[PDB]
C-alpha cells in the first residue's frame, strides 16, 4: 500500500473550537487561494496520498488568518463567540445585534469582507501544480469490442432451413 511517513502531518492544528471556526465565514473570502488549490487537487486526484503538501499550506494559511484576530479586535470577536455558543442550534439567529458590533471593528483593518450572495463555483486559472490526465484509477485499456459490420446485407441462400 505504501502510506506517508510519521512526520508528514503538519504541527499546530485544531487549536480553535468547532463553533469558533463557524463563527467567522470571512475565512472563505480571505485566505481562499490555498484552500482552492487543495480542493482542485482532490477532484483531479482522489487519493489523499498525493495531495498532502497542499494541505500543509492550508494549515499554515489558517493560522495566519486567526492570529490577525488574536492581535486586533479580540474583545468583540470573543463576545460574538460567547453569543454563538449560548444559542442551541440556530447558530445565526438571536445574535444579529452582536454581529453589528463585529465587522465594525474589523472595518478599520483590511480584514473585513462579507459576501451577501455566496461562492457559486469559483475557477482557479492560476493553478498548475500537476497535469490532470494521468490515469487516476485505470490500469487496462479493455480489449477491443466486436468489429461493426459495414455494408448492406444481400439474400444469398434464401433460408438455410430444411426446405425452400
Amino acid at each position: 500500500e505504501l502510506p506517508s511517513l510519521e512526520d508528514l502531518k503538519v504541527q499546530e492544528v485544531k487549536v480553535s473550537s468547532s463553533v469558533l471556526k463557524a463563527a467567522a465565514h470571512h475565512y472563505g473570502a480571505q485566505c481562499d487561494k490555498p484552500n482552492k488549490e487543495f480542493m482542485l487537487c482532490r477532484w483531479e486526484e482522489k487519493d489523499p496520498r498525493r495531495c498532502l503538501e497542499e494541505g500543509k499550506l492550508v494549515n499554515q494559511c489558517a493560522l495566519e488568518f486567526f492570529r490577525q484576530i488574536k492581535r486586533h479586535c479580540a474583545e468583540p470577536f470573543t463576545e460574538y463567540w460567547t453569543c454563538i455558543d449560548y444559542s442551541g442550534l440556530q447558530l445565526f439567529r438571536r445574535c444579529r445585534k452582536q454581529q453589528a458590533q463585529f465587522d465594525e471593528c474589523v472595518l478599520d483593518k483590511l480584514g473585513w469582507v462579507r459576501p451577501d450572495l455566496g461562492d457559486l463555483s469559483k475557477v482557479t486559472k492560476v493553478k498548475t501544480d500537476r497535469p490532470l490526465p494521468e490515469n487516476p484509477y485505470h490500469s487496462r485499456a479493455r480489449p477491443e469490442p466486436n468489429p461493426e459490420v459495414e455494408g448492406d446485407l444481400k439474400p444469398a441462400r434464401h433460408g438455410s432451413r430444411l426446405f425452400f
Binding site: P3, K9, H25, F38, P48, G55, N59, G118
Partner: protein
Amino acid sequence: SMMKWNRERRRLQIEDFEARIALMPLLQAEKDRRVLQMLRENLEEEAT
C-alpha cells in the same frame, strides 16, 4: 405572513450552508487523521 418568514429563513439557510463550504481545514482534519491511524495500524501489524 408565512411566506415572508420562509424567505427570511432562505437568507439564514444559505448562510448556514456557506459555513460548510468555507471550512476546508475541517476536511483536512479527516485526511490527516486517516494517515496517522493507518501508520499506527501498520506498526501494530509489524508487532503482531
